[PDB]
């Protein structure tokens, strides 16, 4: 009673050392009621996951952490309103009205007082203010199953990090002044990789909210479309494993699982429609197989890499690339031709390793 009347924050710690755990939790729940910010309430419910009740507290932390991410992007919109228009303005002068600075501050003012449920967080905030990333987190927490809606969210997230392909404004060579940040082909990939990996880390192996084959097939197509018009000078910032390493290095997706998601991407997708795109995705696939050959350790793995299906895919991929390469060896330039000739010698070595790991069974 004395601490609950004078120091409520010492009160729950004393009750916890007295092993009165359910009373410490009932003081901490009343901190999370009475508290003035969202931060105090996350701390108080986090203690109710260091002490049924635990799962209710962990759900309140879960909603409150996405509710903080909604507040942060609303204050970013208030601080940087010139960017939150200029990233969108590129394709049309359709000035859809910039959000009411009173209503955003009323939203923030209420988001900082009380935790909301997942459907109120989705509807009146995340969907209202076009927060597709925070909408996708709410779909994961809520186990929402509309695979088409999730693919549209993933597309709109990829098409928020990739800047749209610059149209033919004129070479009026006297424009000396403007430090308008030329985002590198590195820097676009660096932002997009971070956007994919850091969302994947909370979700995987949820194939509904992290649809790996779609994220690959659209991400590689969007970096292909962005890079196609670039100079061969900028097509030297692009890592051939830009997405494929980070999905292993951070998201912990096995290189064996990635190899057949890339076989599915090449077999199912619109990659068969254009030579330059089929050369691109087949190059990523063979650099992903080059990663896998450096991770293969056991006799069991060597005994899988020598399977008929893997060997026959590698020989089909080499035959396909080698056919298209000699179709284009009359139109390509004398660096890019050599770039593809030095790739072919890797693919022929990769097929030789799938064959040596096969006949490592006659001894």
């Amino acid at each position: 009673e004395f601490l609950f009347a004078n120091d409520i924050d010492l009160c729950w710690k004393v009750l916890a050392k007295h092993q009165e755990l359910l009373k410490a939790v009932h003081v901490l729940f009343q901190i999370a009621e009475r508290s003035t910010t969202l931060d105090e309430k996350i701390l108080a419910y986090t203690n109710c996951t260091m002490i049924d009740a635990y799962i209710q507290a962990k759900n309140q932390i879960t909603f409150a952490n996405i509710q903080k991410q909604i507040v942060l992007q609303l204050e970013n919109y208030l601080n940087n309103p010139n960017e939150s228009n200029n990233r969108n303005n590129s394709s049309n002068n359709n000035g859809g009205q910039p959000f009411d600075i009173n209503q955003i501050k009323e939203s923030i003012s209420n988001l900082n007082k009380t935790i909301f449920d997942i459907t109120t967080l989705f509807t009146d905030y995340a969907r209202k203010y076009y927060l597709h990333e925070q909408m996708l987190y709410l779909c994961h927490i809520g186990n929402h199953s509309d695979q088409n809606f999730i693919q549209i969210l993933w597309k709109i997230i990829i098409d928020k990090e990739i800047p749209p392909p610059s149209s033919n404004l004129s070479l009026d060579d006297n424009a000396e002044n403007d430090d308008g940040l030329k985002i590198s082909v590195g820097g676009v990939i660096e932002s997009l990789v971070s956007k994919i990996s850091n969302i994947g880390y909370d979700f995987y192996p949820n194939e509904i909210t992290f649809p790996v084959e779609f994220i690959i097939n659209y991400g590689e197509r969007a970096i292909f479309n962005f890079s196609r018009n670039k100079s061969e000078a900028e097509k030297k910032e692009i890592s051939p494993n830009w997405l494929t390493s980070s999905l292993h290095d951070h998201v912990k997706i096995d290189y064996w699982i990635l190899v057949d998601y890339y076989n599915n991407t090449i077999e199912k997708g619109s990659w068969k429609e254009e030579d330059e795109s089929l050369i691109y995705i087949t190059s990523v696939y063979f650099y992903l197989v080059e990663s896998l050959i450096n991770t293969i350790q056991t006799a069991t793995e060597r005994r899988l890499f020598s399977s008929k299906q893997i060997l026959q895919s590698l020989e089909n991929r080499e035959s396909t690339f080698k056919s298209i390469f000699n179709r284009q060896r009359s139109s390509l330039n004398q660096e890019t031709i050599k770039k593809l000739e030095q790739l072919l010698i890797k693919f022929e070595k990769i097929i030789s390793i799938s064959k040596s790991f096969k006949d490592f069974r006659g001894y």
């Binding site: 799962i55 209710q56 962990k58 759900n59 879960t62 359709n94 859809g96 009205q97 449920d117 997942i118 459907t119 989705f122 509807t123 076009y130 597709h132 987190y137 709410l138 779909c139 994961h140 927490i141 809520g142 186990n143 929402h144 509309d146 088409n148 809606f149 549209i152 969210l153 597309k155 709109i156 909370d202 979700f203 949820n206």
Partner: peptide
Amino acid sequence: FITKHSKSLNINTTNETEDTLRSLN
């Protein structure tokens, strides 16, 4: 994030398009 006792997000997304999710109308 998954918990076995989250509230399911019982929304009807079947009327959303790439247009209605990209535009300010």
